[PDB]
Design an enzyme around this catalytic site. Structure first.
Site, PDB file in Angstrom:
ATOM      1  N   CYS A 106       0.820  -1.210   0.000  1.00 17.26           N
ATOM      2  CA  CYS A 106       0.000   0.000   0.000  1.00 17.26           C
ATOM      3  C   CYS A 106       0.856   1.263   0.000  1.00 17.26           C
ATOM      4  CB  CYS A 106      -0.945   0.023   1.206  1.00 17.26           C
ATOM      5  SG  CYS A 106      -2.120   1.384   0.917  1.00 17.26           S
ATOM      6  N   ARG A 109      -0.364   4.543   2.908  1.00 17.01           N
ATOM      7  CA  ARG A 109      -0.233   4.397   4.353  1.00 17.01           C
ATOM      8  C   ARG A 109       0.010   5.661   5.165  1.00 17.01           C
ATOM      9  NH1 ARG A 109       3.890  -0.404   4.795  1.00 17.01           N
ATOM     10  NH2 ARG A 109       4.300   0.087   2.594  1.00 17.01           N
ATOM     11  N   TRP A 278      -9.169   5.569  -1.402  1.00 17.66           N
ATOM     12  CA  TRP A 278      -9.410   6.246  -2.657  1.00 17.66           C
ATOM     13  C   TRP A 278      -8.369   5.833  -3.681  1.00 17.66           C
ATOM     14  CZ3 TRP A 278      -8.876   9.500   1.844  1.00 17.66           C
ATOM     15  CH2 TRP A 278      -7.600  10.061   2.029  1.00 17.66           C
ATOM     16  N   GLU A 283      -3.923   3.548 -11.151  1.00 17.18           N
ATOM     17  CA  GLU A 283      -4.621   2.275 -11.025  1.00 17.18           C
ATOM     18  C   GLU A 283      -5.656   2.200 -12.134  1.00 17.18           C
ATOM     19  OE1 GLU A 283      -5.176   2.881  -6.415  1.00 17.18           O
ATOM     20  OE2 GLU A 283      -5.636   0.788  -6.902  1.00 17.18           O
TER      21      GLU A 283
END
Ligand code: HEM
Ligand code: HEM
Ligand SMILES: C[C@H](O)[C@H](O)[C@H]1CNc2nc(N)[nH]c(=O)c2N1
Ligand SMILES: C[C@H](O)[C@H](O)[C@H]1CNc2nc(N)[nH]c(=O)c2N1
Ligand SMILES: N=C(NCCC[C@H](N)CNCCN)N[N+](=O)[O-]
Ligand SMILES: N=C(NCCC[C@H](N)CNCCN)N[N+](=O)[O-]
Ligand SMILES: C[As](C)(=O)[O-]
Ligand SMILES: C[As](C)(=O)[O-]
Ligand SMILES: [Zn+2]
Lengths: 402, 404
Positions: A106, A109, A278, A283
Site C-alpha cells: 500500500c 499508508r 481512494w 490504477e
C-alpha cells in the site's frame, strides 16, 4: 542482520530494525529471490493474541498496567476453555489500522491513522451483510469526498463456513466472454460475472455493467444482491484538451474497496473485511484501462491521436498512456471526487517512510508495487531501497470460495 | 506440483517452473525473514571446486562430459593449482565463460544477444600504455561507425600477491562532473569523484557539461597513468526532437558506446579485475536516467518549461509528458545519426523471447525484476507482468571495490 537501506537520490541511509519483529516467513531464501511473485505459493493462537494484546496496550501507553494484565488473563481464559477468544471494539479498531500500516504493497499508508472502522461482527445473514456493505459505501463515498473505511464481519470459526464476499471489490464491471472468445467489459471479471449469472442474474451487454454482489453467509450457497445505482458513484472520463476523448464513453467507479482479502489480528482471522480509501490515478489510467489483459484501450486512444502505431520507437504507447492518466485525473477533479496522482502519492509515501523510521525503526515495503506502473524513476520511491517482511496485524490473500 | 519456484506471467496466464536456480552456489541477500531484492549493492580448496564446476560447464557446453579431454583437463587444472596456487583458462574456455557471465547477468535486459559476443583476449597485456591500445582497439571495433557490436576485452587475472589490473573510470566513456563554488555541479554529478581524481592525477580539466573524461589505467603495482581518448574514437550524438525544433537548441548530447569498465569478471574461480565490456544503449538509459534523474543531469524541469507545461502542480503530469519527449528525442537522434540503439518496448519484447528460449535451454533465467522493467512506461512493456526469479550463477560479473 540489520539491513542498510539507501536512497540513491539523496544519499540517505537508515537501518530497518523493525523487520526483526517479523514472526512469519516470506518466499525468499538466500539461494533465490521470489519477491516479484504476486501470490504466495492453542499455544500458537495464544502467542499471536498475547503479542497483539501487548501491541495494543503499548499503543495506548499502558503496558504492565492493571488493565493490560487483566486483559491478558481474559484471553488466556477464553482460549483455554473454548479454543478461541474475541476482540474488544477498540482492540479491533487498533488492529485494523495496524494491518493497514503493515500493508507492504500500500502506497497510501500516510493515511493509516484516519480509518473509520465499523464493527459488523454481529451479522447473521447475507441480507444483513448487504446492509452493512451498503452503509460502508454510502459513508466511504460521502458525495465524492471519499473517506477511508473498513467493515469487519464475523471472524472465522472452527468447523464452520467462512463469511465471504465472492466479489473482488464491492464494485466491479462485468466481463462477458463473447462468441469469438474475446471479452465484453472488464476481462478480469469474466469468471465472477459468470458465477453471478449462474446464480440467476440478468446480465447486461455493456462495457461497464456494475456487477451484483454475491454475499455468502456460513455453510450456505451465496446470495445475489444488486447495488442501488445511486450508491455507486461513477466518473465519466474526458480530456482537458482532446474533445474527442469523451466520445470513447470511458468511465470508472470512484470507490476502490477490496473485499476478498483476509484480515488477521492477534491470531484471529476475518474472512470478510472489505476496506476502501481512494484511487491513485494510475490504477485506473494505467492498469485497468491500459493492461493488455484489461480494457486494453491503448491502441484505440492512439489512432485517435493520429499516432504512428506503426512502430514501438515512435513511443505512441507512452504518449497515449500519459493522456489517459491525465484524462482520469481531470475527470475525477472535475467530478469533484477524491483521487491522487502517482507523484503526490509517492512523495507522501516518502514522508511515511520517514515518520515510520522514527516511530518504529523501519517500514516494510514491496518496491515492485510501490513504484507506479508508469514514470517509475520519475518518482522518489524508485530511488529508495526498501525491505519487505510480514508484520501482524496484516491483510492476507485467501482462496476463492468456489 | 514441482518443488522448484513456480513462475507466472499475469498477461498471457502462462506458467513455468525454474529449475535452473538449483544450479546457484552463491547465496543472495534475502532470507525467509526479509526480502532485500530492491537493494542495489547488498554486501585453494575452494578455488578447485569452482574451477572444477566451470570446466564441467565448459565440456557439457560442447557435449563431451566425462570424455577423455574433460577428465584430462580436470587433472590439468588441479595439477596447476596444486603447484602454483592458481591456473589459466584456454582461449575457447574464456570465450565460453565471458559469454556465460553475460548470459547469467540478472540485471541485463539485453541478454537475447548473449551468444553474439566478441571476446578479445588481452591476457598478455603488461603495461598501462598497452591497456590503452587495447581499449582504443575495443572502442574502434565496438563503435564500428555507429553499427555497434557487443564486445569485451579481458586483461590479466588477479595474481597472488601481485597487484590487479584495473580501470579507475566506471565506464570507458563518461562526462566530467565539476564541483562548483556555489555548491552545484557542472556536467554529470555521477562522475564528480572520478574527475577530482583525474585532476589529482594531472588532467587539465575543462568547463563544459559534456567534457569526455580521460582514462585512468592501472597496471600491477603502479599508480595509474592518465590517458586521454582521441576525439575521433569517441562517437557522440547531438540530440534533437523530431517536432520540437527548440529541443535541438538545448545542446544536449550523449555518447554512442556504453562500456562498463569497473566490473569484475569471474570465471571458474579466477578473477578478471579489468575486463571492460560493451553493447549498445536502450533509449531509457540515456533519456530517462542520465538526463532526467534528480541526481544526474536533471533536465526535466527545463524541458518542461520549454513545452509550456504547468510545473506548479504534479497533477498535470508535466514530468511524465516531458520525460516522454526527452526519450523520443534520444531515439530520434540516435536513429538519425545511424547509431545503434533499442527502445524499451523493443528491448523488453526480445527479453521475453530470451526467457522463452532460456526456458527450453537451461530450465530458467535469473532476472532482477526492478532492473528489467524500464524507468518509464513500465506496465506498458511485457516484462512488468512477468514474475522473475533472481539468483547468482557463475560465471558472472560482480561489483568490485574502487581501487582507491
Ligand atoms: C486512502 C488512500 C489509499 C490509497 C491511495 C491507496 C493506494 C493503494 C495502491 C495504489 C495499492 C496497490 C493497488 C494495486 O496495484 O492493485 C494499494 C494496495 C493496498 N492497500 Fe491501499 N490505499 C489507500 C487506502 C487503503 C486502506 C483504507 C487500506 C486498508 C485499511 C489499504 C490497504 C491496502 C492493501 C492491503 C493493499 C495490498 C492489496 C494487494 O495485495 O493486492 N489501502 N493501496
Ligand atoms: C547488446 C546490447 C545490450 C543491451 C541493450 C543491454 C542493456 C542493458 C541495460 C538496459 C542495463 C541496465 C543499465 C542500468 O540500469 O544502469 C544492462 C545491465 C547490465 N548488462 Fe547489458 N546490455 C547489452 C549488452 C551487454 C553486454 C555486452 C554485457 C556483458 C558482456 C552486458 C552486461 C550487463 C551487466 C553485468 C549488467 C548489470 C550491470 C550493473 O549491475 O550495473 N550487457 N544491460
Ligand atoms: C509480476 C509483477 O510482480 C506484477 O506485475 C506486479 C508488479 N507491480 C505491481 N504494482 C502494483 N501496485 N500492483 C500490481 O498489481 C503490480 N503487479
Ligand atoms: C532503489 C532501487 O533499487 C534503484 O532505484 C534501482 C531500481 N531499478 C533499477 N533498474 C535499472 N535498470 N537501473 C537502476 O539503476 C535501477 N535502480
Ligand atoms: N487503491 C486501492 N487499491 C486496491 C484494489 C486493487 C486490487 N483489488 C488489489 N488486489 C489484486 C491485484 N493483484 N485500495 N484502496 O483502498 O484505496
Ligand atoms: N547498456 C549498458 N549500460 C551500463 C550502465 C550500468 C552502470 N554502469 C551502473 N549503474 C549505476 C549505479 N547503480 N551496458 N551495455 O553494455 O550496453
Ligand atoms: C473519437 As476517435 C478520435
Ligand atoms: C528551448 As526553450 C523552448
Ligand atoms: Zn527477495
Amino acid at each position: 542482520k540489520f539491513p542498510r537501506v539507501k536512497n540513491w537520490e539523496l544519499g540517505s541511509i537508515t537501518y530497518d530494525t523493525l523487520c526483526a519483529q517479523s514472526q512469519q516467513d516470506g518466499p525468499c531464501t538466500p539461494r533465490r529471490c521470489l519477491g516479484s511473485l504476486v501470490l504466495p505459493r492453542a499455544e500458537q493462537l495464544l502467542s499471536q493474541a498475547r503479542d497483539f494484546i501487548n501491541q495494543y496496550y503499548s499503543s495506548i501507553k499502558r503496558s504492565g498496567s492493571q488493565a493490560h494484565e487483566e486483559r491478558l488473563q481474559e484471553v488466556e481464559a477464553e482460549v483455554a476453555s473454548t479454543g478461541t477468544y474475541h476482540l474488544r471494539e477498540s482492540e479491533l479498531v487498533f488492529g485494523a489500522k495496524q494491518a493497514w500500516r503493515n500493508a507492504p504493497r500500500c502506497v497510501g499508508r500516510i493515511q493509516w491513522g484516519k480509518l473509520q472502522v465499523f464493527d459488523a461482527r454481529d451479522c447473521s445473514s447475507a441480507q444483513e451483510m448487504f446492509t452493512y456493505i451498503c452503509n460502508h459505501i454510502k459513508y466511504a463515498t460521502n458525495r465524492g469526498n471519499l473517506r477511508s473505511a473498513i467493515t469487519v464481519f464475523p471472524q472465522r470459526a472452527p468447523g464452520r463456513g467462512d463469511f465471504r464476499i465472492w466479489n473482488s471489490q464491492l464494485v466491479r464491471y462485468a466481463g462477458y466472454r463473447q462468441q469469438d472468445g474475446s471479452v465484453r467489459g472488464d476481462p478480469a471479471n469474466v469468471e465472477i460475472t459468470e458465477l453471478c449469472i449462474q446464480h440467476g442474474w440478468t446480465p447486461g451487454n455493456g462495457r461497464f455493467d456494475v456487477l451484483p454482489l454475491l454475499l455468502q453467509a456460513p455453510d450456505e450457497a451465496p446470495e445475489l444482491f444488486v447495488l442501488p445505482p445511486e450508491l455507486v458513484l461513477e466518473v465519466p472520463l474526458e480530456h482537458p484538451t482532446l474533445e474527442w476523448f469523451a466520445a470513447l464513453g470511458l468511465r470508472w467507479y470512484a470507490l476502490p474497496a477490496v473485499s476478498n482479502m483476509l484480515l488477521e489480528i492477534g491470531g484471529l482471522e476475518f474472512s470478510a473485511a472489505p476496506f476502501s480509501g481512494w484511487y491513485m490515478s494510475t490504477e485506473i489510467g494505467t492498469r485497468n484501462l491500459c493492461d493488455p489483459h484489461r480494457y486494453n484501450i491503448l491502441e484505440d486512444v492512439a489512432v485517435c491521436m493520429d499516432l504512428d502505431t506503426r512502430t514501438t520507437s515512435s513511443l505512441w504507447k507512452d504518449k497515449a498512456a500519459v493522456e489517459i492518466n491525465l484524462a482520469v485525473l481531470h475527470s475525477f477533479q472535475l467530478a469533484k471526487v477524491t483521487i491522487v496522482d502517482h507523484h503526490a502519492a509517492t512523495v507522501s509515501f516518502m514522508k511515511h517512510l520517514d515518520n515510520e523510521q522514527k516511530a518504529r525503526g523501519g517500514c516494510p515495503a514491496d518496491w515492485a508495487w510501490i513504484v507506479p506502473p508508469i514514470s517509475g524513476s520519475l518518482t522518489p520511491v524508485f530511488h529508495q531501497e526498501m525491505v519487505n517482511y510480514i508484520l501482524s496485524p496484516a491483510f492476507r490473500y485467501q482462496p476463492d470460495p468456489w
